[PDB]
Every structure is written in structure tokens, then in C-alpha cells.
Symmetry: D2
Subunit: 187 residues, 4 copies
């Protein structure tokens, strides 16, 4: 699997100086938990939203992975230099993803494809066989040879534990394209 | 017009001659149709996937809107010219959509945004105040000024029937950008 | 109007005496607006600088309203706006235009950047008798989903479907060749 | 300069005496392979033709394995492959390259067409000392989320952070300017 946690470090002074407080979840008053004023901020896993006042109140500031070495780096209109609450953001991402694997059962070298078509696997990382596919979203056709030639393999949302599962007489797939358009409305 | 059902016609002979059969839903046997051997195919609403053997098993051919005048046109790797079952493909495609409204409670002029950041609402014609916002999907950041300058309003899925709802002192939003990435999991 | 247009005001919220520029201004003292209070951009984008002759802190203005000096300085190192100019944006496409009748007559399809697996799905069910590739490298195919005969279509003009190697004038799909692993 | 290379083999599945090609060959008779059974492309793409001197049915080969005659021709009334040439592809894409050290040296970052709100999120936590803008109009920013000092980056070279107006060599986000409203 993967369970990476949100990870923001708020320092006491500007330029990553003084006492560091690592936070991994929502914090409705940062004064109460130790750090009373936050001088810099380092996001290692976000994004995060800061707010002006405790209890997710007032001016919002959005933190993404990177260094925020002063107060003014996160806040234009400076009602305050302060930062009272924080919470991780939890994004909605409807990006069409397919992930193709070297070995059966979702093992070995992989290639993730997001939204785009791929007329040549060799022109990416991948010169290996393709033995399993996870379609996390979208509708794809895989093909044996590059530029969408040879046998067609329709890949729709689901797991494909072995190459036979998606119709392959052997585990060879060198190009993929996404099916984007339907000419009729569904339920 | 605009179709409410897939539309594929299969012909007995090549170049769209002979007895046609119009399918508008799955067919696990194409012998039933009286078009036992399809010689051509015309997709009017698709896409469709045909199969080599009945009940959707064997070699696959994805047919998209257009003319397929001969058996060869759809099976490059000509192990067979058989075509024994056809079914519509149920195409999964999600978007990320936000809609921002001139006047409170989801009324007045409205600007839809899909997937893309928008650094100038003025450049999308929209010069009006933004009083209410409906976020369908995706995670957005509205700004007061163009080029993602000024006060930030995080706009997540659901409804904001006034501008005070998304933390605005006045109903002014002039740029919006999607947040695409996360580095953490539930 | 084919005109870059930025109006600076002397005061905030678009009050006081306006000076409307329609081209570069390397010193804003030779306007009637010593320091700019607010800015409005009707055609852009523009870039301002903190000191004269496009020197110092840079601020990029896009079409819209900037009702205060701090609405455009992320850094308040300065409020000063001492030079402006329009930004001529470099924006390139790949364009191919296919045509129903020979010699670039009849109903036409303009493709830009994107592959097009079904010509019928775009509203074009006509024959393709001539092609004019303006930029990019494309492959047209007889049938949808890049099926059938291939015709490499490169920059330049194809007055008859025989000039791109078609036996009859049928194309129902195009893709762009995007990547090259060699260089000269 | 990387160099175009395709290998044609005398039999299927990359068996038999192989031949490397590195430029236009108008007749594979002067190939000790008088017919090819398979084809591997390492640097492409290549367009091949049914007859000598680049005539008849066209076939576009991209990087990868083509283990039989039928892997590259859809409608066969010929299995022959009698001429090859590289394709010079025209990719008018918007590209910017940001380097760790001055004069275009150290760990680098290429951005094509798309904006980048967080450099850290692309695994670039290094300083940015020099910048090469091949095509497009870009604004670089000190902080993530198009915040801090703005640096307008247009077509050309920046051998040092000082050149694009940076007091210190920190860039943590880029966006591309796409739209203009003047001289169309």
C-alpha cells in the first residue's frame, strides 16, 4: 500500500532558526500546543491551509511543499503576521490513471500514465514485458506494438492480475491511448 | 440532434451493401441479427468493442464513430475476420468543475471552469463581482486579483451561497487555480 | 483594437488623474502620475519595474483591476512604479488543415496540437482531397483509431490526395508525432 | 548530438544477420538483407516505404520492437520494405530549463508547456542559479504558489540569477503566460 502522513514543521524564528514543532494533523490553536509565533514554515508533505485566527477563522493562506522562510512569504495583506490554526488539505483529483507492471500480480518495474496517450513505451522508461495492469480511472486501449498497432486490449477500471486477464497471448504492450469521448449520455 | 443510445449498423457485404442490422445495445451473438458475417460496419454513436467469438471472448476490436468499409479495416492482426459479439464501451471520463456566480445563492451571470487554472477572469469575459460559488469536484484557490495575487479563498467540494462563506470581505475573485497534487494518504 | 492598453491612476480605487499608455514608457515622471495609486489593464499582459528604464523589482500585470499599490507588490520592498511595457508573449501551436476538394477548396477541418481519432466525431464525414501542414509532423489514417493506410504529412502543401500517397481521398484520423530521439 | 538508428534483421523476432541504419537509405538491396523480417528502432522516428526511392505505401516506425512484417503494415498487398529515412519532427513546444549552478551546470529541471506550483514537489530542492528559456513566456517566483518576488523570463539565456533580477538564487515555482490581447 502507501500511508504517508501530512508533515509541516513550524519554526520559532525566520530562516529555519529556533525551536521546530513537527505537525501531522489539524491544530485549531498553535499557541496552546507550544510554538506561540511561527517565524518560518517547511512543508514536506502537504498541501496545508493556514488561517489567521484560531479555530480555522479569518484570512486563509495555502501552503504547498517547499520553504516559507518568513511571515510575509505566505501572507500578502498583513492584517497579522500570525498563523493560529493549520490543517492538511486532502485534495479531490479526478485524473485518469493507469499503471502497467513488468511482473504478474502488480510487482517489478512499473509505468504510471496520467490522462495522456503514449505511442511508444521504449521512448519512456519501459522496454520490459507488461504482465499486469491496474486501471485506477478512465478507459484505455493497449496495443502490442508502437503507434497503436497489433492486437488491441481494452483496459477499463479494475485490476488485471495477469496478461491473459486483458486478452494477451503473451505479456507484450508497447503503446496505450485513452478513450476520451462517448457520443451518447449515460445514467 | 444528440443520441440517447449507442448506434452501430453492421452490413452483410463490404462498402455498406446487403442486409443491415442497427444495434443500440449489447449483442452476445450476431448470428441472431441475420448478419452472421459482418462485411462492413458504420458507427454513428460509440465507441463500441467487437469480439472474435460470441459472449465477448477472444480477440478485440474497438470501433469509434466512422466508416469501416471492409473486414480488414478493424482487424490489422488478421488471425480472423469473424465478429461474433458487439457491445458499447461505457467511457469513464471525470472532470474537475467549479462554477462562480455574480449574485448570492447561485444566481446572476455564472463562469464555469473545467480542470484549467484561470489567471484573469477579465480575459474570460467575466468582469462581474463573484458573490457565490458551487464546487462540483477538484480543490480550488480563488484570489482577489489576477495572477493569483491578494487574499486567498480555499474552495473545496460543495456550496458557498455567499462570498462571506469562503472568507471574502467583498465578492471579488479575479483568478482561480486548481490544486492538483497531494503528498499524503488517509 | 490591436493595442496594448494599461491605465494608471494617481490614487487608489481608480480615482484622481489617469494616464492611459498604449506602448512602452521607460519613465513615468514624463506622465502626469508621479507615483501610481491603482492600475487597470484592458489589453495585456504588461510588466512594470521599481526603477526607470526597466530596472529593479518586476511586477507582471494581466487584464483586470489592481485597486491598490500592494495588490501588485508581493514584496513591499517598494510601491514605486517607474517603467512599464507590454509583454509580447511567445505562443506556438502545431496546425494542420485538411480540405474536402483538391487545391484547398470546400469544407475544411483545422486541427491544432491535439490528436483526432474520429473525424466523424468532429463533424467531418467528407472526403479529404487536399492537406496544408503549417507546423508539426502528423500521420493521417484511412479509418478511425489510426487504422488502415498511413500518410506522413509534414510542413508544406498537398494539392491532391495523391501527393500524400492516398489511392482515394479518405482520411478519418490524425495524430501528431510529438517526440524525436535525434538532433541536428 | 544523439543520432538516428534503426536495425533491420533478415528474419522475425530479431534473428539473422542485422544491419544498422543512421540516415536515408533509398534501396535496402545494398542491405545484405534483401528482405527484412523484423525491425528495432532505437532513435527515431523513421518512415519506411513499400518501393525504392521513397514511393508507394508508407509506414511510420517509432522507438520500439517490430518483430514481424505485419506489426508495421495494416493492409498488406506488399510485405517489402524498400526505403527508410529519419523523420525530422517539428515540435513547437514551450520549454524552459532551470539549473542549480551558474552558466547552465549542476542538477537541472525542464518544464514543458505546463505550470509548476512547487519545485520541492518535483524533487528539486536545490538553488536556481541560471535559466535557459528555449520558447514561451514564463514568470519565475521565489516561493511556492506564485508568491514572493516575480522574475519575467523570456526567450534567451540567463547565465546568473542576477540576470533575471534575483538578489539570491531562489526560485520555487514557475507559470507560463499563454494569453495576449494585443496585435492579436
Amino acid at each position: 500500500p502507501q500511508s504517508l502522513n501530512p508533515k509541516i514543521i513550524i519554526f520559532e524564528q525566520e530562516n529555519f532558526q529556533g525551536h521546530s514543532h513537527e505537525l501531522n494533523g489539524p491544530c485549531p490553536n498553535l499557541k496552546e500546543t507550544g510554538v506561540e509565533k511561527a517565524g518560518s514554515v517547511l512543508v514536506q508533505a502537504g498541501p496545508w491551509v493556514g488561517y489567521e485566527q484560531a479555530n480555522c477563522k479569518g484570512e486563509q493562506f495555502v501552503f504547498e511543499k517547499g520553504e516559507y522562510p518568513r511571515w510575509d512569504s505566505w501572507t500578502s495583506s498583513r492584517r497579522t503576521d500570525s498563523l493560529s490554526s493549520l490543517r492538511p488539505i486532502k485534495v479531490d483529483s479526478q485524473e485518469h490513471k493507469i499503471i502497467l507492471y513488468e511482473n504478474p500480480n502488480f510487482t517489478g518495474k512499473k509505468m504510471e500514465i496520467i490522462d495522456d496517450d503514449v505511442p511508444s513505451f521504449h521512448a519512456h522508461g519501459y522496454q520490459e514485458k507488461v504482465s499486469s495492469v491496474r486501471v485506477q480511472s478512465g478507459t484505455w486501449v493497449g496495443y502490442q506494438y508502437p503507434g497503436y498497432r497489433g492486437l488491441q486490449y481494452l483496459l477499463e477500471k479494475g485490476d488485471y492480475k495477469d496478461s491473459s486477464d486483458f486478452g494477451a497471448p503473451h505479456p507484450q504492450v508497447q503503446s496505450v491511448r485513452r478513450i476520451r469521448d462517448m457520443q451518447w449520455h449515460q445514467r
